Design a protein around this ligand. Structure first.
Ligand SMILES: Nc1ncnc2c1ncn2[C@@H]1O[C@H](COP(=O)(O)OP(=O)(O)O)[C@@H](O)[C@H]1O
Ligand SMILES: Nc1ncnc2c1ncn2[C@@H]1O[C@H](COP(=O)(O)OP(=O)(O)O)[C@@H](O)[C@H]1O
Ligand SMILES: Nc1cncn1[C@@H]1O[C@H](COP(=O)(O)O)[C@@H](O)[C@H]1O
Ligand SMILES: Nc1cncn1[C@@H]1O[C@H](COP(=O)(O)O)[C@@H](O)[C@H]1O
Ligand SMILES: N[C@@H](CC(=O)O)C(=O)O
Ligand SMILES: [Cl-]
Ligand SMILES: [Mg+2]
Ligand SMILES: [Mg+2]
Lengths: 233, 235
């Protein structure tokens, strides 16, 4: 059907049902906004598998999400939401641009997980923003902002344990949420190694840092995460 | 044993008194921009800043704002209460300008229906990065009550200041505060309030502030002299 949006990582098509979309995961990887864009064979299948797996578990734990089913190698069937243009970032450990903002090593545990908002606007390079900025931008009000925080946290509780159980330290991650057709906020987008940090106990980067920093082949390590994930239940 | 240089800043030196709790702040003829890049000595800047700051703090004190100000003491110096600084630059915007304008790719000079408060962690080595409330806590700078007190006091201070500069024809675009714990552990307003840490436009959009130095739009002491001349008419 029709291409609604062509992203850096996914293409979004319509279905015959108004409220439903098909998300198609691309073999494209990007870093730093640009440049740093590369086609990587089989990255879309891995990411679609990993995301379909996590969302299914989230659905089972009672998290409201856009996930309905995985459909092919590359595609999944999703609830259509109106996206809240925030990247909601949760950190358990210092890493990346938090290590840069505060001049501190990566890998220091944070006694309380910190959530950060970034305005999802590529033209602005998704700047870091505060709650008053959220309101200014008319993105969400006080209650909804509180809701986004508390839901991201509850989701972190689940995920951190699951990854722990397969031996990966969930350092940080990035969520997006959206208004469903009945105006409820639900989790959407994707949860892949594209938008989380995963270290093993030896500190190996089992995520997109491998690509950002040129540490090795992206799909080898994504494949390892996939294999580990299937040992869950 | 009365007068020791506790600290040398970009715009003020601070010295001991014989009274433990009191400090003399000495304003300097030095201007900086882009955390240390464009550094110039500017004759007369120190007295203007000391003058404007002495003035505004005195009016703040009379309005009931707890501050560090005791008395202007010479052209250059002022007698302050010694605080333990809260390393946060608390910024309030009334209008869009500067790095807000950049962050949101929006023009300078748009009115903000509600004034916006922003924290920058006051650390020169990290270039005073923008931070959120949870970052304040991670940093162990202040807990939830103290954070809301900072906001609520900056806002009230804004309510006064915006009215005062209005009465003499300048629009108060934005400013930056610092606060600190006093000898009794209460939070008070400290540092300086001068055109160095506020934006001031006249009705023609003229820059009556440090932007004149930053953007190289005219001689700095000329403009600050103008603000000083106008402030004396609220007197
Ligand atoms: N369930 C959904 N309904 C509608 N739009 C969605 C949904 N999930 C994700 N989107 C949007 O689809 C696009 C997916 O493309 P992606 O490649 O991830 O975008 P980006 O380049 O912003 O990372 C994003 O704009 C994302 O917010
Ligand atoms: N009442 C006070 N008590 C103690 N220290 C203060 C007080 N007011 C200001 N300071 C500190 O004096 C220092 C010197 O001032 P300044 O030149 O403005 O330094 P900066 O380069 O940090 O702007 C600043 O670090 C400031 O926080
Ligand atoms: N995918 C994404 C896009 N913007 C941020 N992230 C994710 O959010 C976390 C925080 O990243 P950073 O430290 O670079 O801000 C990392 O897991 C990163 O993949
Ligand atoms: N003086 C200072 C040092 N750091 C911030 N400021 C002040 O903070 C306000 C916001 O500036 P910006 O938009 O550049 O963050 C301006 O009035 C500016 O002088
Ligand atoms: N990096 C984000 C989206 C983006 O900023 O382009 C993600 O992985 O979903
Ligand atoms: Cl920032
Ligand atoms: Mg994306
Ligand atoms: Mg200063």
């Amino acid at each position: 059907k029709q291409l609604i949006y062509s992203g850096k990582a996914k293409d979004i098509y319509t279905t015959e049902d108004e409220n439903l979309i098909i998300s198609t995961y691309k073999d494209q990887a990007t870093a730093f906004n640009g440049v740093k864009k590369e086609q990587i064979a089989g990255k879309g299948v891995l990411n679609n598998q990993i995301s379909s797996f996590i969302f299914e578990k989230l659905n089972v734990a009672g998290v409201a999400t856009h996930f309905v089913e995985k459909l092919s190698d590359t595609e999944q069937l999703n609830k259509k939401v109106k996206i809240i243009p925030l990247e909601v970032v949760l950190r358990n450990y210092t890493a990346g641009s938090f290590s840069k903002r505060f001049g501190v090593d990566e890998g220091i545990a944070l006694e309380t997980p910190i959530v950060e908002f970034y305005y999802k606007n590529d033209d602005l390079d998704d700047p870091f923003i505060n709650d008053e900025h959220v309101k200014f931008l008319q993105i969400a009000g006080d209650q909804q902002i509180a809701y986004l925080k508390e839901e991201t946290r509850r989701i972190n509780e689940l995920l951190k344990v699951w990854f722990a159980e397969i031996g990966l330290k969930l350092i940080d991650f990035k969520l997006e949420f959206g208004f469903d057709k009945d105006g409820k906020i639900i989790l959407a987008d994707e949860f892949s190694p594209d938008n989380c940090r995963l270290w093993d106990a030896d500190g190996n980067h089992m995520d997109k840092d491998v690509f950002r920093r040129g540490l090795g082949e992206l799909t080898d390590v994504y494949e390892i995460v996939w294999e580990k994930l299937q040992e869950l239940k």
